[PDB]
Amino acid sequence: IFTFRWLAVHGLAIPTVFFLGGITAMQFIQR
Amino acid sequence: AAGESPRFSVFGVIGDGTSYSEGAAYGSDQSAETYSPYSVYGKVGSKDALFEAGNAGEIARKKGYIVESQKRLKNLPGYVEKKQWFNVKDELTRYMYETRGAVRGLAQTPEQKKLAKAFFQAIEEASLQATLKNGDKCAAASADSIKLLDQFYASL
Amino acid sequence: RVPLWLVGLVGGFAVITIVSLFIYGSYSGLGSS
Amino acid sequence: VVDYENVALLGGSQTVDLNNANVRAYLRMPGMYPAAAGKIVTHGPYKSVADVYNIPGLTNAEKEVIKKYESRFTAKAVAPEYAIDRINNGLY
Amino acid sequence: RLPEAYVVFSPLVDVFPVIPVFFLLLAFVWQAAVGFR
Amino acid sequence: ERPFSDIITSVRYWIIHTITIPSLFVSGWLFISTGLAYDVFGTPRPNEYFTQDRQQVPLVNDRFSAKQELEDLTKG
Amino acid sequence: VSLWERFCAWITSTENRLYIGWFGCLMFPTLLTATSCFIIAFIAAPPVDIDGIREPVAGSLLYGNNIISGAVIPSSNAIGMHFYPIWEAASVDEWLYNGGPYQLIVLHFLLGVASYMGREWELSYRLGMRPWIFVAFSAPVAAASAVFLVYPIGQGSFSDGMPLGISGTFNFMLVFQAEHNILMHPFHMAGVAGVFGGSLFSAMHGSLVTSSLIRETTENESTNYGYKFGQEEETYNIVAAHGYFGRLIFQYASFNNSRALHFFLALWPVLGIWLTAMGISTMAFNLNGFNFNQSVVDSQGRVINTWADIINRADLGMEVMHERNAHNFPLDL
Amino acid sequence: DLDEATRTVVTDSSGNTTVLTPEQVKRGKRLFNATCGACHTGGITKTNPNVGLDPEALSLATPRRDNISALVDYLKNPTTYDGLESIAEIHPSIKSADIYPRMRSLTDEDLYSIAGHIMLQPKIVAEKWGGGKIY
Amino acid sequence: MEALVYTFLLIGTLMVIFFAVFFRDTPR
Amino acid sequence: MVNWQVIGQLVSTGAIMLLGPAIIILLALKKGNL
Amino acid sequence: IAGRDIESTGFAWWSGNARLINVSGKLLGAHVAHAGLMVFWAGAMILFEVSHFVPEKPLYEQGFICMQHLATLGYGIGPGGEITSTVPYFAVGVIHLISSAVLGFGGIYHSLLGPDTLEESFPFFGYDWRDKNKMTTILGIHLCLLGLGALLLVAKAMYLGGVYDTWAPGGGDVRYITTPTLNPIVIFGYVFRSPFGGDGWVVSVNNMEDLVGGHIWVGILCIVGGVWHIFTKPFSWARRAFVWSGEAYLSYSLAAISLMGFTASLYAWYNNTAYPSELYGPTGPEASQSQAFTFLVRDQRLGANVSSAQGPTGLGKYLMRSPSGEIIFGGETMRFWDLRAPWVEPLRGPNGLDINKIKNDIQPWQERRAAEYMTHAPLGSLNSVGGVATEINSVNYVSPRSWLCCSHFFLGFFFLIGHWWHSGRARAAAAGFEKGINRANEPVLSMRPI
Numbered sequence A: 001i002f003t004f005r006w007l008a009v010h011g012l013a014i015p016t017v018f019f020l021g022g023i024t025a026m027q028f029i030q031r
Numbered sequence B: 001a002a003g004e005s006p007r008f009s010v011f012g013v014i015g016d017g018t019s020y021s022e023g024a025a026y027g028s029d030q031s032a033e034t035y036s037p038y039s040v041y042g043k044v045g046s047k048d049a050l051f052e053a054g055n056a057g058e059i060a061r062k063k064g065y066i067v068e069s070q071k072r073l074k075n076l077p078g079y080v081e082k083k084q085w086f087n088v089k090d091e092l093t094r095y096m097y098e099t100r101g102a103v104r105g106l107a108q109t110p111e112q113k114k115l116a117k118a119f120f121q122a123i124e125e126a127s128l129q130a131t132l133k134n135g136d137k138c139a140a141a142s143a144d145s146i147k148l149l150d151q152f153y154a155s156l
Numbered sequence C: 001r002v003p004l005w006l007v008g009l010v011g012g013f014a015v016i017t018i019v020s021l022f023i024y025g026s027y028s029g030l031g032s033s
Numbered sequence D: 001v002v003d004y005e006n007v008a009l010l011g012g013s014q015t016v017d018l019n020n021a022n023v024r025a026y027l028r029m030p031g032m033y034p035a036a037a038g039k040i041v042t043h044g045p046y047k048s049v050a051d052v053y054n055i056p057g058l059t060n061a062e063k064e065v066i067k068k069y070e071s072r073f074t075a076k077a078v079a080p081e082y083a084i085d086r087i088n089n090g091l092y
Numbered sequence E: 001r002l003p004e005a006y007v008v009f010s011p012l013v014d015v016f017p018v019i020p021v022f023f024l025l026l027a028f029v030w031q032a033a034v035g036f037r
Numbered sequence F: 001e002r003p004f005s006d007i008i009t010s011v012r013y014w015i016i017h018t019i020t021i022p023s024l025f026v027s028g029w030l031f032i033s034t035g036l037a038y039d040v041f042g043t044p045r046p047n048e049y050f051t052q053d054r055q056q057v058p059l060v061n062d063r064f065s066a067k068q069e070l071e072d073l074t075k076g
Numbered sequence G: 001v002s003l004w005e006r007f008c009a010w011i012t013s014t015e016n017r018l019y020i021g022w023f024g025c026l027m028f029p030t031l032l033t034a035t036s037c038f039i040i041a042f043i044a045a046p047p048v049d050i051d052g053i054r055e056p057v058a059g060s061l062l063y064g065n066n067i068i069s070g071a072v073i074p075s076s077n078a079i080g081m082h083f084y085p086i087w088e089a090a091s092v093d094e095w096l097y098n099g100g101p102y103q104l105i106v107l108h109f110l111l112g113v114a115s116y117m118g119r120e121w122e123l124s125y126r127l128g129m130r131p132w133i134f135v136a137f138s139a140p141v142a143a144a145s146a147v148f149l150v151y152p153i154g155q156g157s158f159s160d161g162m163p164l165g166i167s168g169t170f171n172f173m174l175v176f177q178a179e180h181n182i183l184m185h186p187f188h189m190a191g192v193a194g195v196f197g198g199s200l201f202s203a204m205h206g207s208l209v210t211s212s213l214i215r216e217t218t219e220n221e222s223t224n225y226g227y228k229f230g231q232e233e234e235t236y237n238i239v240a241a242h243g244y245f246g247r248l249i250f251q252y253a254s255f256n257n258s259r260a261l262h263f264f265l266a267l268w269p270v271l272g273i274w275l276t277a278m279g280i281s282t283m284a285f286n287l288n289g290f291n292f293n294q295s296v297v298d299s300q301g302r303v304i305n306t307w308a309d310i311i312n313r314a315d316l317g318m319e320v321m322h323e324r325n326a327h328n329f330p331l332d333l
Numbered sequence H: 001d002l003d004e005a006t007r008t009v010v011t012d013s014s015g016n017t018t019v020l021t022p023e024q025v026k027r028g029k030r031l032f033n034a035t036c037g038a039c040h041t042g043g044i045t046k047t048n049p050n051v052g053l054d055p056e057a058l059s060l061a062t063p064r065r066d067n068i069s070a071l072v073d074y075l076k077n078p079t080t081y082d083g084l085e086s087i088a089e090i091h092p093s094i095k096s097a098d099i100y101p102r103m104r105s106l107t108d109e110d111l112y113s114i115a116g117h118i119m120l121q122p123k124i125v126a127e128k129w130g131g132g133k134i135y
Numbered sequence I: 001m002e003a004l005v006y007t008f009l010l011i012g013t014l015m016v017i018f019f020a021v022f023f024r025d026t027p028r
Numbered sequence J: 001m002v003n004w005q006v007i008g009q010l011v012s013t014g015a016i017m018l019l020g021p022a023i024i025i026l027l028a029l030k031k032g033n034l
Numbered sequence K: 001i002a003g004r005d006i007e008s009t010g011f012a013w014w015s016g017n018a019r020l021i022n023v024s025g026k027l028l029g030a031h032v033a034h035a036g037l038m039v040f041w042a043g044a045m046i047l048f049e050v051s052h053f054v055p056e057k058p059l060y061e062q063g064f065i066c067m068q069h070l071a072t073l074g075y076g077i078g079p080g081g082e083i084t085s086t087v088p089y090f091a092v093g094v095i096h097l098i099s100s101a102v103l104g105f106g107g108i109y110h111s112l113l114g115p116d117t118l119e120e121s122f123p124f125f126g127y128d129w130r131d132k133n134k135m136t137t138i139l140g141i142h143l144c145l146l147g148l149g150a151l152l153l154v155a156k157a158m159y160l161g162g163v164y165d166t167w168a169p170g171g172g173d174v175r176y177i178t179t180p181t182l183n184p185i186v187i188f189g190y191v192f193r194s195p196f197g198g199d200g201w202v203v204s205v206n207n208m209e210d211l212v213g214g215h216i217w218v219g220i221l222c223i224v225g226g227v228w229h230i231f232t233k234p235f236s237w238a239r240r241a242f243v244w245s246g247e248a249y250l251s252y253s254l255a256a257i258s259l260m261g262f263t264a265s266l267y268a269w270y271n272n273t274a275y276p277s278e279l280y281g282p283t284g285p286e287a288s289q290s291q292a293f294t295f296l297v298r299d300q301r302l303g304a305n306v307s308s309a310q311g312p313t314g315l316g317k318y319l320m321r322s323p324s325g326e327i328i329f330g331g332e333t334m335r336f337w338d339l340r341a342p343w344v345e346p347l348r349g350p351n352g353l354d355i356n357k358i359k360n361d362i363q364p365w366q367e368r369r370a371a372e373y374m375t376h377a378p379l380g381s382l383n384s385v386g387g388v389a390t391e392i393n394s395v396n397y398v399s400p401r402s403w404l405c406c407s408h409f410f411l412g413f414f415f416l417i418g419h420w421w422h423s424g425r426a427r428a429a430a431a432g433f434e435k436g437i438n439r440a441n442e443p444v445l446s447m448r449p450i
Ligand code: CLA
Pocket: E021, K013, K014, K015, K016, K017, K018, K250, K254, K414, K415, K416, K417, K418, K419, K421, K422, K425
């Protein structure tokens, strides 16, 4: 619950999902 | 300004559809027909087409082609008599290039088709004999082309 | 108890559809000329 | 040469030198480019503007447009490096 | 365009050309099924 | 311990992940679609590159007065 | 025995200082004649008209060059792809005026390198080895052949091949960038990754093996003296080196098999060089790299630039100034 | 954005103006970049760079070609720069649609859209329609 | 006059290569 | 204005892709000669 | 299970198809299945290309590589190279697609259900990779089939409709080839020609008579060789020089197929007789020659005398002389003076281009063709932009010539790598030291010191 691997993997994983959602949203923007 | 939602259209099915940059539309943004969903133009024989089929311009240009080709083709024996058969080939591929299209576009009755086929075979034989450097055969084939061409002109 | 040859298939499907979506967006929309 | 005094008559001004200007210098005078300018740029040196009308071939039409634009013409000395390229000078 | 009697089948035709690759992928799937014996 | 090879199998792992991940994905989608990123990072909108008055690129020319220059260039 | 049998036994003998073999019969004369011609032409050749516009270019030391700017000029543009041996010129002076030595050197050289690959295989066979070193050597040979022969064939003239000089190489690179937009072709990126990764892995492997040496020398002698010719010791210490590599990065990434390691080492740069050679070969037929010019526009329709547009400006600058007196028409087809 | 003021172009020799509907812009752009792109990409002429498509060259033609009507008329009957001879045999046109098969399926609306695109381009990009490789 | 220097340097390098190849310490 | 082409293409591609693994699963279940 | 695991054969899963070397039943099924896949792709590609056809654009503006072959064979093409109907292409695609199913079923049966080895119940269809007589028999049989195929092409060219001829007197049209050339001097001068510029080796065939005569001679040679290799066995000089195993035969085939791929790519790039320009587009030299011709015509129309106009270097802006004397086009295109196209030959005399014919004998159709070929040069990018590298995004076109050349060149190089690898392994395994160095009897330790 507080192990080093937990912190590392989640700190690398949460922004990844956030950014992937952002990029997928960007894909449908048209000027 | 302070806040606004960017406009969206997914695959062209949900959204605006017409945005000057959509892609993968296959139509669905034009109140007009198309030849196929993969084409930048409409059909040819549509009611709004400017170019008709069988105008006076066609039967003027093709007849001019035919008569000028007859005038040009009347020059082969002078070249053959001088053994200048390279001029014969250059003549057979310089201006006469449009004759195949003109004759095939002016051939409707089956007898015209047969006469055109005979004329094409005669001209091919003449070109082959010119390449092989045979005076008698090429001269006879040139006379053959002349007679067949004038017969086709008279038949039209 | 998924065997270790189906979850990899799901991951492959996810990554291939993401890549395909990115290519399609490259061909259509912003930055498509 | 380093210094050419008649550089403004090559097409950059309202006056055109009949002896050294390229055919592209007549594109700013409507109704003159493909025929009258073509005839002008392919014939011998002119000692004055009045010498242009003596070109053998000039039809009445041409002569009319040249008279219309006569006020913007001049004839200077012939420069061999400029006179040779009066149809294709490498500019596109 | 296809002859008028077959225009309805156009979506299937638009997919046939790529089938020969799915075979190559299926070979790997079959090998993975038996656990890379 | 408890390596990934059987972490990938635990059902509780899967259910909590199915609960959590879509919330993050939708949060990112809404972050882009609302237009809040344009204000957080200052990126111009597709209709904001050129305004009705300024028809050239807005380059910054001063070091210690960049705030006022940017405030002028954005809207004023 | 006969005379032919004795000759064959001498050719294929594994006791000479340098192996000859049957491939050596094609190898040695071609390489020797190429070397002789190259040296003589590099030292004392007259200017060569490369572009066919009667403007010869000096490339030899005796005509006012140094080592950096000297070269052997490619053949003339008027020749094209025609075969131009010595006996086809009215005189040796005319042969030297039109860039004769380039074809001779290139052709005998390519035959020599092909025979080099064959000879490598032949010695591997005669020594009882496994025959896959010439496959690794095939990549530099492929690249050299690609440039020297394939690019002229596609472009239609030997004059577009790479000059045999140092600054000629830079000129070739710059013109190729201007005309084909390399650096945006994925095969070039593959080649760059290949060379960078090769250097990285060479340094890593050397460091790991050198650090894992056992103690046989103490202080007053070079550590190299510990190893003896014919000694038996695997090229690492498993505990120390494996622990170091498993601790430096995550433990899952560590090669405990020498075979797989030394296979990956061989495979990476070779594949990179193969891909970049094929990239050059395909670009020889006018299949250029990615084009991203004026691809971002605002709502109204104006164009917003990117870095690709700056690259395009540099390309235009290079293009408008190369071979200044060689073009007459707007398009460089 | 593409306002209505930007979409207002001259339509007649007198000076009358007309607002192009939003769909016509896209239709004209598509039709142009597909029947004339190969030789007039960017507003230039590749086979004769002396006669471009920028507004200045259009304004100094003999019959004048800086409005929709004159562009449509030219597409129906091409002439030289001084308007003294016909070049319908060496230029695509409705009059010579038999020679050029690409011109056989064009309507009046299509020609109108093409002319509208040609007229609208100088007002959007500016100084880059018919400029060359410098810009 | 520097062509002499360039030629001397190149020939010296070739001589060094020849001596290294043919007059070498035995691997044994 | 519905653009049935994209739906048809997606359905066809999905069916074609699903055909193969279906036969693999069928052969595995029936204790076949995998 | 036995025969499908590493512990019984070696040959781990990533090289599992190497377990079929000595199993002659499953190998047949595998090869038949690959053949069925090839037929399926052919049919599917034909159908896909037919579905997207547009009757206005030329074939080289739509990215087709399959319709052009059928058009050249004389199907649905008219005068000048215009497409009239697409029914025969549909028929060809349907027939290929249907035959693919039979081929695939046969492959599946012979691979999954049939006997593992054929050397126990069908002695006719059996071999040992070392029985030279059987290998020669198989080679002769399939060789006779190849000869029959070549003769079938000849028969189609001569009696069954004819073929499209781009050098025809009056524009390209379908015609019967009634007088094929049979003099062996011409054909075997084509074969024994140098490959450098001006000669071109076999790429340089420039008329249909030579093509038909060559395919005739090839058919005759293949039939004779098939019979010979069927009725004989390898001689003494061949037995002591080759390696007799399956991998050796594979490498032998690989080298030849790589050479064929290189030759086909260069055909596609340079030839314009078997690849008429009305369907594939202009070749590399053709676009530059067209540009020079177009600008010569324009400048002559403006009023210049284009024979004495001096270029920037003093060499001649429009006309000059080739290193042998012929009159050629000026500029940077002096390298492409070997070009021969049906739309230029009207202006060529006994010593190059004709001055008088150039002066007052140029027809408008030649001008139109030159402009088209100038504006459709084979230049493009990976993402299909088209034009020089410093161009902007306006058109979407890459010529099929570039695609064909690049693809089959890539394949040829990699199959040459195949020759090297598979042949080296075959010989090493035949000798008997492909596993490693025998530590007990290391051969190097018993050689005289160096
Ligand atoms: C007629 C062609 C042919 C044939 C029949 C063979 C036959 C054989 N080869 Mg050989 N080979 C060939 C050509 C051929 N080769 C060529 C041209 C090369 C040069 C690249 C090689 C290089 C080669 C090597 C290096 C080896 C073989 C081996 C073998 C044997 C086992 C092969 C196996 O199990 O594959 C199994 C096949 C696979 C695992 C497929 C892997 C997938 C590939 C790598 C990716 C291909 C990507 C492709 C371009 C498309 C990508 C699409 C994607 C983007 C979706 C077998 C006797 C092996 C051997 O000696 O065994 C004793 C071996 O080690 N071959």
